[PDB]
Design a binder for this molecule. Structure first.
Ligand SMILES: [Cl-]
Length: 396
């Protein structure tokens, strides 16, 4: 994909449609983070008639571009579903009918625009993906009775918690590369996510890349699942940042990688493999830090969060940080098999007793949503760096 391949005539033709579609509103059916299952209803107008949004489609995996705000769509979903239990965790997508997959709704920007951040765009892997590999797998991977609707967790991931805190739209380009992902879409670099995003952004209206907050975390699935070499992940990561900044990005959040060798799946690994993967993470994290320093010197607005250090603290002494267990999967999974993401799994007795909000790990690989929230809160804290970005205020 290349944004340069899109012509002015193509942009005009695409934007000249003004069709309509419906909104699928998803929600968690159970009343805590222990239960990942979800269901949906069509969004409704206040009188119960079906809600529609006007706009146009584009696909190079179709996105719907509308002038209806994300806040209004969310409100319609909340009013329609009327969930009164905790952890409703509502999300929504465009869909013409029940056979459609979950398409992202993009709210076009207005002509009148200053310098405030007006959306978050996320790049990365299974620590950030909110539904891309899930759509590519026709909703079979990860299994949606046990992993929360296309997220590799029991709920929202860190980018979603940041977006919620700042009252911003989140548009996700991250692609899960966890074990078993190979079967739905060949491994691609994070630079290919940047290229794809820029092609979709060419169809947006009044889009100013300097008003996007970009998030980038990558490399964990590459080292753990694809045995990639550090020099190749460095090249992919550097290329992505060159392309993103060349396209006009100014505001980027970077993070170091957690030491994933502390995850339960490495109970089934050799010490040699633990040492090999760990050394790659250590080396790659220094490259992330050097890239951040470089882009700061070049004049960009960069934050760098040391997720590696936060995660070392959580796995070393979970109780100091509000967790009870950082060594075991919450799910009753007693092996490290790619196939396990295809099946449903129950909580262990111990996780059910203490609750999944007290565990660091959901399955054998990924953090629980309580950890994702903990990461987001650390990143949002005063002095942690986000003050350098131009956020809107909201009196509510
Ligand atoms: Cl997992």
């Amino acid at each position: 994909l290349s944004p340069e391949a899109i012509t002015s005539a193509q942009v005009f033709s695409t934007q000249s449609k003004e069709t309509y579609t419906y909104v699928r509103c998803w929600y968690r059916t159970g009343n805590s983070h222990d239960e990942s299952a979800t269901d949906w209803e069509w969004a409704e107008n206040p009188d119960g008639s079906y809600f529609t949004i006007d706009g146009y489609w584009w696909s190079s995996k179709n996105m719907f571009y509308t002038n209806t705000s994300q806040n209004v769509i969310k409100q319609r979903c909340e009013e329609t579903l009327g969930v009164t239990h905790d952890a409703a965790d509502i999300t929504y997508f465009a869909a013409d009918n029940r056979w459609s997959y979950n398409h992202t709704i993009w709210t076009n920007d207005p002509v009148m625009q200053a310098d405030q951040i007006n959306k978050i765009v996320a790049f990365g892997d299974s620590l950030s993906d909110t539904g891309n590999i899930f759509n590519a797998a026709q909703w079979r991977f990860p299994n949606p009775d046990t992993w929360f609707l296309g997220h590799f967790s029991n709920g929202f991931v860190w980018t979603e918690y940041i977006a919620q805190a700042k009252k911003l739209p989140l548009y996700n380009w991250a692609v899960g590369g966890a074990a078993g992902s190979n079967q739905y879409v060949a491994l691609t670099g994070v630079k290919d996510q940047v290229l794809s995003y820029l092609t979709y952004a060419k169809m947006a209206k009044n889009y100013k890349p300097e008003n996007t907050l970009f998030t980038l975390e990558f490399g964990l699935n590459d080292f753990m699942n694809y045995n990639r070499e550090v020099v190749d992940v460095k090249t992919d990561f550097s290329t992505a940042l060159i392309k993103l900044t060349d396209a006009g990005a100014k505001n980027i959040m970077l993070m170091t990688l957690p030491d994933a060798t502390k995850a339960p799946q490495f109970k089934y690994s050799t010490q040699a493999e633990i040492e090999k993967v760990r050394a790659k993470i250590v080396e790659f994290n220094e490259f992330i830090k050097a890239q951040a320093a470089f882009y700061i010197i070049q004049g960009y607005n960069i934050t760098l969060y040391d997720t590696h250090g936060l995660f070392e603290q959580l796995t070393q002494n979970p109780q100091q940080h509000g967790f009870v267990n950082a060594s075991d999967a919450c799910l009753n999974i007693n092996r490290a098999s790619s196939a396990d993401y295809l099946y449903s799994h129950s909580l262990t007795n111990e996780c059910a007793t203490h609750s999944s909000d007290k565990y660091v790990f959901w399955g054998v690989t990924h953090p629980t949503t309580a950890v994702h929230k903990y990461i987001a809160e650390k990143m949002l804290a005063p002095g942690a760096g986000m003050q350098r970005f131009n956020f809107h205020h909201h009196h509510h």
